[PDB]
């Protein structure tokens, strides 16, 4: 099993994990749980730790699905990622209705602290802030930016560090897949600046929702992301329209080529649950791209 497990093989190449996004609905259906046990070393909650799932009315938290995933991971010896803690999407209306800076600051801090404390010491990495950038590299004008101001990112990270200093704290975004695209250099410059200002950004997580042929660009984009000087970078929500072995192998090689890249997470198991962009088909059989990653990693 290990000889065809992308997680075991990537660990044998010196990386920390090959991970997957999942949740109770996947783990109790089809072959998802068996595939994840065999092939993936880290699980991320597809939805169960987002703000809409965990705090749908202020101070009224729901951890049913998040608890399920965390205990499933512990029983199966998997690393655990969490998030997203601060995100403009999947955000309850009670949050976006707040217009007072002190109120939203307190709410955001409590949301971060409550989630992170509940699982303190069990979570390898948290996505603390996601999708904070516009495509031109300016900051996205979300309720957090508008109400708290640019300090919301420093505040979120400082609050997260205090709640669980064991975890690696990530900023994440999409369309960081080309070293030419304005967004990639912009997040690098801003993260460099924030870290110089003492903000505890441990990682940049690149979603990596690719279209066909875009894998080649990740070979250049990921080193550029690593030049921000964060402790870690990662590939966080990988899928590839057309699922070409060439695109998938290029993403894997990009991580292999970057010393600070700790691992890769694919955004689900089987295609119907994702452009047929995943590594397993609707019969839960591995696709050519899965076999190609295995062959690339073997030595």
Numbering used by the authors: 1 to 274, 279 to 303
What do the paper's sentences say?
Here, we investigate the molecular origins of the nearly billionfold rate enhancement achieved by directed evolution of the computationally designed Kemp eliminase HG3 (7). The Kemp elimination is a well-studied model for proton transfer from carbon that has served as a benchmark for de novo design. Although the first-generation HG3 design is significantly more efficient than an “off-the-shelf” catalyst like bovine serum albumin, its specific activity was further increased 200-fold over 17 rounds of mutagenesis and screening. All HG3 variants have an inactive conformational sub-state, rooted in the original protein scaffold, which was gradually supplanted with a catalytically competent sub-state as evolution progressed.
Cryogenic structures of HG3 and HG3.7 in the absence of a ligand revealed that β-strands 6 and 7 (located adjacent to the binding pocket), adopt two distinct backbone conformations whereas only a single conformer is observed for HG3.17. One conformation matches that seen in the corresponding complexes with a transition-state analog (TSA), and presumably represents the active sub-state. Estimating the respective populations from the volumes of duplicated cross peaks shows that the inactive species comprises ~25% of the HG3 and HG3.7 samples at 25 °C, but only 5% of HG3.17. Although conformational selection has been observed in the optimization of other designed enzymes, including Kemp eliminases, what is striking in the HG3 system is that the active conformational sub-state was not explicitly engineered into the xylanase scaffold but only emerged upon introduction of the 11 design mutations due to a serendipitous backbone flip. Instead, design created two “energetically frustrated” enzyme conformations.
